[PDB]
Each structure stands twice: as C-alpha cells, then as structure tokens.
Symmetry: C3
Subunit: 101 residues, 3 copies
C-alpha cells in the first residue's frame, strides 16, 4: 500500500475532493488536518493556513490517483507525494484492497 500526501487551500476544497476520490474508489480513506504553511510564493516568504490530506490506497492505484488529483485540485501545481509503506498489518491491508478499485 502507499500513503499519498497533498494539501489544499481550505477545508471546503479538501473535503469535496477526498469525498470524490472515495466515491471513485481511488482511496480507502483520507485523514485531513490543518497546518500552517510557509513557502516562497515566487518572490517572498508567504504564510497561510492550509489543509493537509493523508490518503491511503493501493500501490497500483498511484498513477490513476495522481492524474485524478491533478484534474480536481484547486491548485494548478499541487503537491502529490507518494510514500511507500514498508509493512502493515495484514487485516488492514485486506480491508484497504477490498474498499478500493
């Protein structure tokens, strides 16, 4: 399985998109939480509140999920980061596989 991380400018867009990803069976679950982001907005250091999303899905759904997120994401250049899971309890993996495409 993999974890996929992306961030959204607000809760409205984060919830709309992850509900869509769940409806499309592209992810088994999403964990959303606020964070304060600091980055260069091409020119100057900017700070603002965003909603971080931790998505859990199958390894083989990565490319489709990545494409779908590009299509639905409010940002023109969103972050879509893949972290492979080295091991996981089997019953949970079974549940995740069953819940996804």
């Amino acid at each position: 399985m993999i974890i996929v991380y992306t961030t959204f400018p607000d809760w409205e867009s984060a919830e709309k998109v992850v509900k869509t990803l769940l409806k499309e069976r592209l992810i088994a679950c999403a964990n959303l939480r606020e964070h304060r982001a600091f980055y260069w907005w091409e020119g100057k250091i900017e700070e603002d509140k965003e909603v971080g999303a931790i998505l859990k899905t199958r390894e083989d759904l990565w490319e489709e999920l990545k494409e779908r997120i590009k299509e639905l994401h409010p940002y023109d250049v969103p972050a879509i980061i893949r972290i492979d899971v080295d091991d996981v309890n089997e019953d949970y993996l079974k549940w995740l596989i069953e819940e996804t495409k």
Copy 2:
C-alpha cells in the same frame, strides 16, 4: 529507526495505549494529533474525528510493537503502518535506542 502510524477513535484510547507502549519500552515517543477521517464504513462514506498517532521506535521492535498494538487497540482492525526512516541524526538515533527495549 522506523515511524509507525496508527489512529484511534478518541484521545482517551490514544493516550492510554501510547502510555502503555512507552511503559513497555516498545516506542521512544509518540506524537498525537486530531484529524478528520473520511472512509467507507463498508457501505457509505463516513466522517468523524479521530486521533492520529506517530510512533518512533527501532526497526527491530516492529513485529513486537505491531502485535502489542493489535492487543491493546480499541479497533478490531486498526491501521498499523510502518514507514522506514532513510536517515536521521545520530545523536537522536542514540537516544531512541537507549530509551527502548
């Protein structure tokens, strides 16, 4: 070292279990924080607040830790996810090894 991620239905269960894991020297530290979880509860998309736990421990304590979490966790099928750390500052690794089993 590894990071192990699991989630709990509430703060009471998350704190009880991680304190137990620390008492048993199965982890060096735990970081707990709330998130909003969205997932299929087998049938329909559900939303609810949960407590995410980031556990830091030794690579060789993975299997024992995974088993202990299954035993203590309120969920019948909890998520117990292992992410290997590619590198870390040595003094911190030394502290983590000393604090664990």
Copy 3:
C-alpha cells in the same frame, strides 16, 4: 525529493527556524502543526505540546539541511528525520528544485 521531519518546543522557535531555512533556500516549504508529545524525559513519562514541522526539499540538500537544523534548533538533541519520497508529480518537483539552492 525528501520530506524532513523535526519538532519544536513551541511555535515561536518553529516559525523562526523555518523562516530562516526558507531564507537560506534549504527547503521549498514547511508545514507546521501542533501535536501532543509523550516520551521518557530520561526517567519518567512526560507529556507536552510541541510543534511538528514537515519540511520538503531536495534529496541532495539533506546533509546541509541536517547540519543547519542542528545549529538553529532550540533542542540540544533534536529529531531530524529523513523520509525519501518514492514518486511525485513532476511539475511540483520542478517548482521545489527551482525554489531551493
């Protein structure tokens, strides 16, 4: 690219340090959020609120970033954890490379 995780005793130190890392172009962005930490303070289980920092930067900036964090961090033994990213959307990687050293 890599994710680098570290934690701070408070928001004042976390923001001061990540702004410095951005000014020095050692990271492309930082996501900060509070968590409750539980650990052995060498002797007894302690609990306290801390600020977790998720830093995103280039793979080849790891050693310099790790050294800089040791120098700036309020803790004498901070956690500086490196997690390699297995894949990421190309346009985001391009932005991250351009924003860093």
